[PDB]
Design a protein around this ligand. Structure first.
Ligand SMILES: C[C@H](O)c1cn(C[C@H](O)[C@H](Cc2ccccc2)NC(=O)c2cc(C(=O)N[C@H](C)c3ccc(F)cc3)cc(N(C)S(C)(=O)=O)c2)nn1
Ligand SMILES: [Cl-]
Ligand SMILES: [Cl-]
Length: 375
């Protein structure tokens, strides 16, 4: 009975290979499953046969498709695609009750982008126009939705790991979280860039300079699976996580994501692995808060009577990426109207009877305006 009830439970995932929402494009309607990605800013849909796609967009059957007569290519950290730009009517049947004319890239060729078995056929880039291809003149979908309709300029995501979740567009649903929401500023509107001001592994501060945790940016990115950390931070965090979980030894490759470890169904010794906290800059001077995840968020299942896991914190050379490993702990509010991102503990996050993910505050942290990187 909350007012946003019909958007609850509108996301699915097939064996953990990306969270997607149904979107209906063109006229008469063509509904496709679209991956939700807050790490990019193009709306693009498979528009030609591919071995991994069950369905694709057929422009010649949509009477409202308009050709913008321009190609587009988008490379990501993983994979890339190429296609043709146009516009068409778009609605989200378990989203807001509106229809907008949005730009759409029709994917005609791709490399290592579509994932076999994932059940999604396109991508919804929810970040800002600064990072869209071919350039920032190509209005992203959520910008079209806010400009064309009354829908408030905010959306929130609850990614429920193991796969489903909720994308609430235009508000917050209080059933999806417990405790209070705590907000960090969006530093700049391009990616959803935030500032991380301290990192702890089981209560123990990693003690790096905060400028290392944000070198060269820290972003919130639902289309990236892992928590990705810059080189020096990743090396330092692995050394600390190893030291904390030293009652069991694992091969070096397990911490590089190259070996899996499996336990008999139901027996994974979660308690031997530490919690991990990131402190983020708060909304008042000198004030911060911390979000804490469990090994149930950073050890991810790979699908016998065997539970196999991959360690899903990994190295980046393009900054901190708070991917699904972070987002599955939390209900995350992308309050674009107030230029801030809110975290609360997710009502669906995976935990055990001893430990829960957490969002706590306030803490005092001085000189946070010096943590960010300057281009
Ligand atoms: C604007 C810019 O240039 C850009 C932005 N991004 C980050 C985007 O989120 C892109 C979007 C995307 C979505 C599907 C397939 C390929 C790429 N994401 C990635 O580049 C990406 C995508 C993935 C990936 O497997 N994503 C899948 C769909 C996924 C699977 C589970 C899940 F919970 C969430 C996402 C993994 C990674 N890594 C490098 S990793 C092993 O460290 O987690 C990166 N990269 N470059
Ligand atoms: Cl129609
Ligand atoms: Cl990434």
């Amino acid at each position: 009975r909350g007012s946003f009830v019909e958007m609850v439970d509108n996301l699915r995932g097939k064996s953990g290979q990306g969270y997607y929402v149904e979107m209906t494009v063109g006229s008469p309607p063509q509904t496709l499953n679209i991956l939700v990605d807050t790490g990019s800013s193009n709306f693009a849909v498979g528009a030609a046969p591919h071995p991994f796609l069950h369905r694709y967009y057929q422009r010649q059957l949509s009477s409202t498709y308009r050709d913008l007569r321009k190609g587009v290519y988008v490379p990501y950290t993983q994979g890339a695609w190429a296609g043709e730009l146009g516009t068409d009517l778009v609605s989200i049947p378990h989203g807001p009750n509106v229809t907008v004319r949005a730009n759409i890239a029709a994917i005609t060729e791709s490399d290592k982008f579509f994932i076999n078995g994932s059940n999604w056929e396109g991508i919804l880039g929810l970040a800002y126009a600064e990072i869209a291809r071919p350039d920032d003149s190509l209005e992203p979908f959520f910008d079209s939705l806010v400009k064309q309709t009354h829908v408030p300029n905010l959306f929130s995501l609850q990614l429920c790991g193991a796969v489903g979740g909720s994308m609430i567009i235009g508000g917050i649903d209080h059933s999806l979280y417990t405790g209070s929401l705590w907000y960090t500023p969006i530093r700049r509107e391009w990616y959803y860039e935030v500032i991380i001001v301290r990192v702890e592994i089981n209560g123990q501060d990693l003690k790096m300079d905060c400028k290392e945790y944000n070198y060269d940016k820290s972003i919130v990115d639902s289309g990236t699976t892992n928590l990705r950390l810059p080189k020096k931070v990743f090396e330092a965090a692995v050394k600390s996580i190893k030291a904390a979980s030293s009652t069991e030894k694992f091969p070096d490759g397990f911490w590089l994501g190259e070996q899996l470890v499996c336990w008999q169904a139901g027996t994974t010794p979660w308690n031997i692995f530490p919690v991990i906290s990131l402190y983020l800059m708060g909304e008042v001077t000198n004030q911060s808060f911390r979000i804490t995840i469990l090994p149930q968020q950073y050890l991810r299942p790979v699908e016998s009577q065997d539970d196999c896991y991959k360690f899903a914190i990994s190295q980046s050379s393009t900054g901190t990426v708070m991917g699904a490993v972070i987002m599955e702990g939390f209900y995350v509010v992308f309050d674009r109207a107030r230029k801030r991102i809110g975290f609360a503990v997710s009502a669906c996050h995976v935990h055990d009877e001893f430990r829960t993910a957490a969002v706590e505050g306030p803490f005092v942290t001085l000189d946070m305006e010096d943590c960010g990187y300057n281009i």
